[PDB]
Each structure stands twice: as structure tokens, then as C-alpha cells.
Design a protein around this ligand. Structure first.
Ligand code: CL
Ligand code: CL
Ligand code: CL
Ligand code: CL
Ligand code: CL
Ligand code: CL
Ligand code: CL
Ligand code: CL
Ligand code: CL
Ligand code: CL
Ligand code: CL
Ligand code: CL
Ligand code: CL
Ligand code: CL
Ligand code: CL
Lengths: 259, 260, 261, 259, 260, 260
């Protein structure tokens, strides 16, 4: 049968739950996971990149901050079509990776969050026309998923009519972009991905912590302050730079070690 | 909603209207425009290349000759889908680029920006089928034309293929003729056809495209006295290019490295 | 008119019928055919690679063994759409190449066909070895394509392959992986019906299974030779054994025909 | 006149003194500094790489911890030959970079530390034979230079009598390498570069903080605890991974920005 | 015996004497000459690049203007050591290349092959020290001169640096002046100096190198009436080039991929 | 202390002694050995390449035929300087690699690891000077020999150049003969000469190296009855290779990507 043309961009929010796991997790990502992944999807993924997270900002834990990276794929077909389950060579995946990322405790873990989006942002809510000449961005990418029982339309209205205006009003915030998560692909619990730019960590904190104190706590709140969602389960985020050297289909040359 | 699979090749005809602008325009193209462009479309454009124009031949101005280059994209989806208007980072674009290229006069008339979408494969192979790269170096004259307002498109097509092309077919100096209809429906381009017409060199191009074409009758809709009978830069644009470019940008770009 | 999105993987079985032709054939492949091919399809082929064949194993001739390579493309559109026949620059392809590959006879007083099999990009049947990773070790990957002869009912052949042949693969502890797909016959009229890939540790393991263990099979009535694969070499069966890795991943790795000093 | 074949490895310890400067500094490094540098030295530098620093460990400030990266060059000729001062295009270097790196203070500035070494380590003090298969390393590279007035042979004797034995005895320490800094190139105040590997940050701390508490404080000490040297002036360091994606002569493709 | 470490930059001034030869010469350069070259010297040349020439300016013929490109190598060893004469595979070099470049006539006295070795770093920085790429696009005019037979080299030098270079220094149109003595010991090159002189554009180049130079007295050894006073293509060669080239051949070449 | 500039080319003759070891040896070479190697020497090796051997020809076993590949490095400094013994990360090297290559027997005699350093340029060009790539595909037979213990080296050299090479020159099937003395001082290699001898193909190689060589007298030091008269794999090693390899590892390696 036919395979549907389904161009999409996906994001995976990759945490590292203890600094002692960092070297191990980073090695696996760069020495093992890169070549396994390219080997599988080179013919139908047009871009595969990792954006290392900036250092976790103050209170970043409450936003499900990914302390390793964002992993980004651009797909031409849906990775969730059942026919794609078959692979000649499966990924090398030690169970410890799940420990390093916090999906399982060492002995509740946090879920694996893999959000599919259209390739192009659906809503441009502040900063249209910004160029790279306008300067370096502190790009805070956040995904959120309303808790069970919350009407999605109610959640949407709160996001766009209460949360976003506070971003728009902040001079520290230079860009706001948003898309709905393509829930139909893989059952992701997330509903929205937003990306919110600042000049710097102090700007992020001023807006996302201080200015947000002005919001009323919703009745579905899972924590007392914005984002009001359970970290790592109903909100994940990362702050990243404009540029990454890990544009892996173009730039990988094997795991070359320092002398 | 779905995005349509729409594989296309497009061409942009990039002029440089004064030699004094060449260094600035070329810098912008190679230092600024490449990375901005790659940054936007890497996931859905499979090839992005520039083909620098050979030196303008005698009387090339009458053919809307692009004195900088042809820019070529191969798309998997239509760049004019309105959902593609949203971009995280917009292109860095000094207004002077438009002066350098002739879209706006410097401080009588502007020339339009000509961006023609085509199928990835030529629709008509009218001379030279089977020529390979071992047969020799080509002077590849790519020309796009658009008939003026009021001219019936089927009449112009008929003229093109029954009066103009037979002259190319008869000339031993012309080694290849290829043609496609412009996909009008993507972006409202005024052009109707893109042709590519190969010669051995500039002198061959001239013998055929200037001297042999003198035998044509001037059409009633002509906007200049001689072939192509179309208003330069508005209803005809062109460039002569080589078979090869070093600027295959998605594969070969390594940043703006400067000569020592 | 529209062009249909048709993601596929294709394999070409490239033989070299005398060692005296190897240098010339290899030169043409790497010096002439690579750049000609990339020049045509770069915008709509996402991967273009060559997998050199391991040395032909004992009795490999009976399996239509490709002594040069497998050539692999991953396509986004069908190469057989008639609109794709038109090319600005055609590829340089002398009839000598067909001699070297065994498609035509070498000098004036039967050829083997050109086998170009189109497949979905993902294997349709995963029959043994599911979950095998690269960490499990080096594979001797035996890729084979078969086509039942004229007048053999295709469902009958399928059933023989999957109910009589594959169980022998399953029982051999030497065989670490069996994958299969149906050939997309509709694209180009290819006479092959199935492509299988069957992994071993090494040549000895291949031989043990594909020669010794297969002696247990009854000879089919349609058989074109006495022993498995029971099909006419190069015409109804072609194969190659290849490694997990190739350096000739041509759209990423090619830098021109640089010669040794 | 002739140019001398002078193969060397150099290290620059690049700090980022406030998180607010991180996006700006990182942009300048990857957008501006890479192409300017490649443009000058491509013909006589065989490797040019950046190794981003792991997160600053507890008490890392006392070790002159570089919070951006180590910058590494491999040279075929001495960059300090006066003939090399002439360049067709000079680098684009705003003064603000000096503020971001702490060369210009927000009390006193920190010096620009640029140490030249032989390409090969001079002393293999622990872990000879270790391969990449043995696992991920937390590579702590530290340069030290003894205070003015201190005899270099005295400093050396202290280092070898008192410090090296502790590193060798600790099970947490899997590798120790050292080289003398080439003084004669650029007047660098540093005297040694050491590289000391651990499994992780916790192992680093146990050895470099807890085990070192047994040392007596030398008479020339500029701080109370090991390394006993003035942070950023007489000691600089960074912990890095085995691999970097920023192998710039091979891997750079211009400043491609995230979508 | 040992090989001497001899880091050097060389420049070859490549002309194209008729536009009709341009497709053939360009093809040989990019299709045949690149891979033969890389094949021979990859282990001991750290950079190999082509800088295509900007359009020949008015009166550029009098400066031995290279209508194709500058070819630039960075060597770790001297290519003229007799031990390097032995090569497994010799380059493919049709006699027609000598015609296209003007070393011999087609069927026009021949012009010599000018291959100038230099140190990797400019020896004299005479104007514009500290200029960065941020300061703007440069029209980089690279010129090599060799004084005629019989002329004392010290006298030539003093004229160059006390009469010629002060006119460049005085001109606000000239943003950069760099110079090196040619390493004549390597290959017997007839040239004595390479200079690179930057302007904003062709108009600036003309104002300085034609108009401002009219103030110079004609020397007694002059081979033509106006500056540079030297026989074009024999005692003076040059090219105007951009800051950047896409043809950084050891990094950027991917074979001779042809346009569709 | 100083490091001496010592540009050299080295060859390692890599055997695979049983076809059952091929997939394992090949994997180690490409998956494990390439990155460990590049990690160590990127800053002072300018080229690192593998040339896979063609199929062993009839009687090739008598020539110490390397059934895997030639490994080729171009060095800027001597890898055997004792300062280079120290390495941050040592290469991953399982004992089995020695079994696969025949250095140690699996359970009849081991063969030595042959690693021959040479100057970057061939010292002697004895046939076929001027041959270009346009002249056609070559079957390049690279052979190293070392005279047995007790044979005076000058006597061996005399035999090689006065008796063996003339047979190569007499054969029209032999299109090239190149030779260098092995730099024995670097690492104690027991080999004395590396030759490269080209043919059209295997049948040409056989005609010359087996049939034509029957005319030679057997030397008193012979270790086997026929040419090369030297103990296979101990005093002669060789491989036949193509002109091109895709395994130019410093430029072409992108990690161990596995077939789908
Ligand atoms: Cl922690
Ligand atoms: Cl919930
Ligand atoms: Cl709370
Ligand atoms: Cl009109
Ligand atoms: Cl109409
Ligand atoms: Cl007119
Ligand atoms: Cl049949
Ligand atoms: Cl039979
Ligand atoms: Cl801070
Ligand atoms: Cl203190
Ligand atoms: Cl002309
Ligand atoms: Cl003269
Ligand atoms: Cl005159
Ligand atoms: Cl012996
Ligand atoms: Cl014998």
C-alpha cells in the first residue's frame, strides 16, 4: 500500500537527572545513538539535530527542564506507521539510558515526551520579522499538556488569553511562536509547543517567574505557580541557542576523541 | 491539515545592474543569503544552487540578461503555501539589494523579481536528446519568456514552437533545446515558458539568437524590434551558464572564508 | 499534472563475469556512473549507495551471485514515470559495460538480464532475529532475489518459500536474521517476486545452511536446476553477500575520482 | 628567511563570567570567530576545536573553571613568529568579548591564558593503556603557574612530592597526564598543564576537594585550599567530554539557525 | 635525504584569451585539473583554491588581466624539488589548454605561464592595517610585476615603493596595500613583486590605477606608455577578485556534478 | 626539544587469512580502527586511506598477497619518535585481530606485521613515465620485498634492478614500474624495496609475474623455487589494487552507518 507524505518536525525533551550521569548519557547519545539513528532513517528524515540545553535557570525544575538537550527530527513520513516498526538493525539501547534520563528510578519515573508538529509554526504571536541580525536569542521551548479532565478548549483559551498576553507585554520577550501538538501520531499527552525568546536567563526569570505571579491559580493546577503543571509529566522545556554544531546528517564524522 | 507533495524546480534570474555593485551584491548573496536560506528550508528543499552567469554577450541586454547568476531551488512542497509564511528567523535583507539587482532604480523603471516554478523534469526535449557530458562543454542559455497582456497564450505557444524552435533545430551551432511551461498557479509569475538552448560558445549563441532570428517576421504584439520581441527584464529574462557550479549550497557551503 | 509521493528502495544486482573486466567495470562505476547518476537524481533520491560483494562463496554461481556489487537507491518518486525519461544530460553508458556485467556476450560469434527490483523502504516480513542490534556482531548479509518461472502460480511459490524454505533457516542456529519483501512488480516489470536477506556469521555458515541443510528439500516440479534455489542462475535468482557498512554512500561521501599516488 | 617547523598544541581557557552573557559570547564564537580564524590559519593549523565545559562543579570557581570552553589549536608553525602579525583581514573582535570572558571586570580582570604545549603529552602518570572502550571520561584539564618569586624547581617538587601521589592513589582518578608549558613562545605565566580524569563530578570533588584537604598550605599559597593558586590568574581549568561536535576545520557549515 | 619544511603560498595567473574558449577552459579546470591536482599533492598542500576574476575592467588588458582566475596553492614543501618530478599518474593536459590560456597561438605572440611563489604571510603592510571583514566588501586587485631585462632590481624596488605605492596610499579609494617579494630561487619566475591593492569597486580601481597614475613620469625602461609601464602578460599580470570563493577545492569538491 | 619535519608515506599489507574472518576483520577496521586512528593522528597525518585488494590472483599466495587491503598513511613526523608513544586514549585492539590477519595462528606459522615507511615520492620511475588517468584503468600490483638474512643488500639490489626489472620492461602487458627503497631506519622493517608494477588486468599480471619470470635463474638464496624466490608474507608481501578508493578516511568517514 501507499505511504502518506507527512512532513513533520518532532521534538524530544532529553533530561539528565544527575550530573554524575552526564558523561555516560552524552557518550551514548554521540557515540552510539547518532549512528544507529542515521542508519535507520537517512532516506526519509531530512534533518536530525541536537540542541544542547543552556544551564538550568533558577526554578527551571518547575518547568520540566531538560538538562541534556532537545532532539529534533524532520520527517517526510510518519515514524508511527506500523510498517516502520520493522528494522534490519535495531538501536543499541542499554536500560541505564532510561535511568540517566529519569524515565525509571535507579532501584515514578518521568515519561518519554516525543511531540510531533507541523514543520512550520502555526501562530506567530510576537516578534514577526525578527532576523538573526537582531542579536542572540535565549530560546525557551516549552511543551504543555493539560491534566486529565480539563477541557482542551478551556486550556487553549487560558493559554492564549491569560498566559500569552503577559509574554506579549514583557519587553524582555522578543518572540512568541506556537503550534498544536499532532496528538494523532503517537498519543503524546502534550497539547501545545511554544517557543518564547529572551535576551538571557535574567529576562526569562523576570517574565516566566515574576510577571507570571500575576496569574490566578487555575482549579486544575498541579503546582502552586505557573506553569501550574506537573514537571516532566505535563510540562517539559529547554532553553537553547540559535545554532548547534550537532546537525547530525551533515556534520557527523564518527566519535573522534580528544588527545 | 495535510501538506501536498509538490516536487518542483524553480529559477530566479539575478541581475547586477552596475559593476560597482558586484562586490556588495555578491557578498550579500554568499555571506548572508545562503545561511539564512538554508536555515529556513533545509528540511524540505533537496537542492539549492547558484549558477553564475557568463559574461553578458553582445546584445544580451535585449534578452534581460542576468549579470549575477541563476538561483535554483528544488522543493518538496510549495513555498507559496500560506502556512510557510511563518518563520522563526526572517531573512536579513538590506533594501539596497533591490537597487543592486535592478528591482528599484537608484536615488528610469524598476525590473520585476522573476521567480519561475517548473516541474523537476523538462517537459519537451526538442533537440539533442542523448547528449552526455562527454560530448563537451556547453554554453547553456536559459531563457524565460512571458507574452504581453492581451496576447492569447495558445497563439504565443504556437509561434514559439512552430516559428522559433525550427530555427534552433536547423542551426548546427545549437546542440540542445529543452522547454517547460511555467507553473503559473504557484506565485503568479508573468512568465509562460522556460527554455534552455545550448551552444558551443558565445559566437554560436550570437549567430543563432541574433543573426538567424532576423528571418522571423516581427509579431504584431512585439515590444522590441528584434527577437525575442519582448520587453527586456519584464517579459524576457536569461542567463548563459556552465554545466557545473561549485555553489551547490546544501552540500558545499562552509561559511564565508576570506582570502588571505 | 501531479507527481505521486512513492518512497521506495531499489536494488540492482551487478555482476562482473571475468576478473579481467574488474578494473574497467569498477572504473566506470566510480569515475563515470556516480557523477552521472547524482547529476540526474540528487533532488529526489535521498540515498545512493554501493555495497561491494564479498568474494563469491563455493557454489555461489548457482545463486546468481553478483561478483561486483549491489547498487541501492532510495527514491521519493517512481523512476519509471514516463515524465522522468527526459534528462538534460544523459549518462555515459557504453555497451562494453553490458559485456562486463554479463548482460551481453563479449564478441560477435545468452545474456543475463538486468535485474532492478523495487521495494518498499521497510521490510515487510521480519521472520527471524527481530531485535538484533549492531552490538551483536558483524553480519555476513546474504541478499537474494527470486522469481518463479513462467506458469508457476505465484501463491504456490510463496507458500513453498515461507512453509518449506524458511523453516530450514529457522532451524539453523547459524542463521541470525531473515527478512523479506515482495517485489513491486508494477513499477518496471521486474521478473523477481521476492527479495530476502538472510544473515550468517560467515561464508561457512552460509554454505552449511544454503547448500547442506537445503539438500533436505524436495525438488519442485518447476525446478530449473537440481538443487536449491531450484531457479535459473542470473535469470530467476540473483544474490550477493555484503557487509553491514559501505564506504560508498555516494551522496554524502563522494569527492571525485582521486587516484592513488 | 626560513620558517621553523614547530608542531604544537595550544589550549585557551575561555570563561563566561555571567549566564547573561552566554548567548552573546556563544554567538560570537560560532558565528564570527570561527570563520575569521579559519580564514587566517587554514594553511598551517591542522586541527581547530572547541570543547564546551561541563557544568561548573562545586568549588570549581577556586580552580579558575572556564565556564564556556577550551579552545584547542594544532599548529605547524609558531603563531608568535613576528612575520605572522601581518594579516590581510583582521579578526572582528568587539571589546564586549573581553567583558563576557572576564578580561575586563564588571575587582580586577582575568588574564587571557593561552598555553602552548608539545602535541604529545610529556608524562603519563596514571592510566596508561586506557582505551575508549573502558568508558566515558570526565576530563579535568587544569593549568597552573607558580607565583612570582617562587622557584620553578620548587613548584615542581611540590607538585610531584605532594600532589601527584594523591592523584595516583585515588581509585576515582583513572588517568593523569602532564606537560610543561612552552614558556618561550608567548610569555604564558602557566608552567604545567595537567589532565586528570574521573568518572564524574562526584569523583572529581572527592579527590580535588576532599583528598586534597590533607595537604599543608605552602608558604607561597594565594588561597587557603588546594590548588593554593589565584583562580583565573595562576590556575585555570575545565572539565570536558571525550568528544566534541565542534571540530571546526572538518565540521563547520556556517551559522545555521534553528527553525 | 631530508625534505625541507618550506611553507609557501603560490599564485598562478590564468587567462582566457577569447570568450569562445571560456566554456572549454572552465570545464577542463573543474572537471579534469582539480582531481588530477588533488590526487598528486593532497598529502603536502594544505589549501588549493581558485578565485574567479571579476569582469575585466576598462584598460585591464594593459595590466595583464587574467580573464579566468587566480589559482592559489599553500605548500608545505617546495614543488620544484627535483624529487617531486616523479608522479605515479601524470596530469591530463591537452595542448588546447595552452591555446585557451594564451601560452601559444591558435593556428598573438604567446604569453608565459606565470607561477609566483611567496611566503604564506605578506611581507609589507602599507595601508589599511586592522581592516576586518566587517568593514565591507573588497575589490581586491592582485598584481604581480617583474622588471625588464637590464633593469637593476634595487632601482625597480625603489621606484615601486617610493613612486608607485605613495599614489595608492594617498587615494581614499584605496583601502589596503599589501606586498611581498617573489621567491625567485624556487622556479625562476620572472616576477619580482606581488601586490594586492583593494578598492570598493571597479570605478575606484580605475580612478587610482589609471587616472591618478598619469602623474608618474614614464621610466626609461618603460615597455608601454602608461602605468604599469610593463609588457602585459609578460612582465605584469593581475586579477580583481572577491573576498570569498566557493572553490576551496580540498574542502568543497564533490566531483563534476552537472546541471539538470 | 624539536620535532623533525619528516614527510613520509607508509604502507601496511593487511591480510585476511580465512574468508570466515572477513566480516569481523572488516568491521574492526571500519567501525573501531578508523576512529581510534584519526583520534590519535589527525593533527600530523595529512592522508589516511585504505585500498582494498582485488581478488587474489592465481599463484598470488606465493607473493604474500594481502587479502584485505593496503593501509596508507602520509605522515609529517616520524610515528616512531619515542615521544609519540604517549597517547591519551590507546587504540581498542582485540587479540583476535592478530588471528584474522595471520600474525598469530588460530590454534600454522604466524606472519609478521609489515609496515614500510617510504618517501612521499617514488624514487625510481622505470617504465611508463607520463601515463595519465586518461590512459585507462590500472591493475596496480604493489609488492614489497626483503632479502633473506645473510644476503648482502647491494647484491639483492643488483639482482632486482639488473635481472627482475628488465623482464617487466620487456613485457608490453606491464604499463608502469615504480620503486623506492624502504626507510629502514624508522622502524626496523625487514623489507628493502617497495615496487609498484601495473598491468591491465589479472591475466596480464599472470603472464608477466608467473610465465615471463620463469626465465629467471633461481638465486642461491631462494626461499621458494619460483619468482619472487622469497618467503611469502615474511620476505614478500603484495596487493593488487584499483586507482581509486572510496576509503579516504580523513575526508570521507561519517561513522559506521549500517545497511537497512
Ligand atoms: Cl547532580
Ligand atoms: Cl493528569
Ligand atoms: Cl507547588
Ligand atoms: Cl504587458
Ligand atoms: Cl490566453
Ligand atoms: Cl527595439
Ligand atoms: Cl521462465
Ligand atoms: Cl542442475
Ligand atoms: Cl550568573
Ligand atoms: Cl581563600
Ligand atoms: Cl572574445
Ligand atoms: Cl624583458
Ligand atoms: Cl603603449
Ligand atoms: Cl631470513
Ligand atoms: Cl617452492
Amino acid at each position: 500500500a501507499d505511504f502518506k507524505f507527512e512532513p513533520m518536525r518532532s521534538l524530544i525533551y532529553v533530561d539528565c537527572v544527575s550530573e554524575d550521569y552526564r558523561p555516560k548519557l552524552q557518550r551514548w547519545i554521540y557515540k552510539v545513538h547518532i549512528p544507529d539513528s542515521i542508519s535507520q532513517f537517512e532516506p526519509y528524515v531530512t534533518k536530525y539535530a541536537f540542541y544542547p540545553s543552556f544551564p538550568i535557570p533558577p526554578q527551571g525544575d518547575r518547568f520540566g527542564y531538560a538538562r541534556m538537550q532537545l532532539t529534533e527530527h524532520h520527517w517526510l513520513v510518519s515514524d508511527l506507521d506500523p510498517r516502520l516498526e520493522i528494522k534490519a538493525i535495531a538501536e543499541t539501547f542499554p536500560m541505564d539510558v532510561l535511568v540517566w534520563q529519569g524515565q525509571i528510578p535507579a532501584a515514578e519515573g518521568n515519561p518519554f515526551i516525543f511531540a510531533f508538529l507541523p514543520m512550520w509554526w502555526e501562530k506567530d504571536l510576537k516578534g514577526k520579522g525578527r532576523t538573526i541580525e537582531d542579536g542572540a536569542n535565549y530560546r525557551f521551548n516549552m511543551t504543555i499538556g493539560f491534566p486529565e479532565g480539563v477541557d482542551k478548549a478551556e486550556g487553549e483559551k487560558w493559554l492564549f488569553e491569560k498566559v500569552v498576553p503577559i509574554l506579549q507585554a514583557a519587553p524582555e520577550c522578543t518572540r512568541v511562536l506556537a503550534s498544536a501538538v499532532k496528538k494523532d501520531i503517537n498519543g503524546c499527552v502534550m497539547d501545545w509547543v511554544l517557543e518564547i525568546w529572551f535576551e538571557n536567563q535574567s529576562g526569562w526569570y523576570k517574565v516566566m517567574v515574576d510577571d507570571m505571579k500575576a496569574l490566578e491559580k487555575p482549579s486544575w493546577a498541579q503546582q502552586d505557580a505557573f506553569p501550574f503543571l506537573k514537571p516532566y509529566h505535563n510540562v517539559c522545556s529547554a532553553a537553547v541557542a540559535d545554532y548547534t554544531p550537532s546537525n547530525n546528517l551533515a556534520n557527523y564524522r564518527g566519535y573522534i576523541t580528544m588527545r
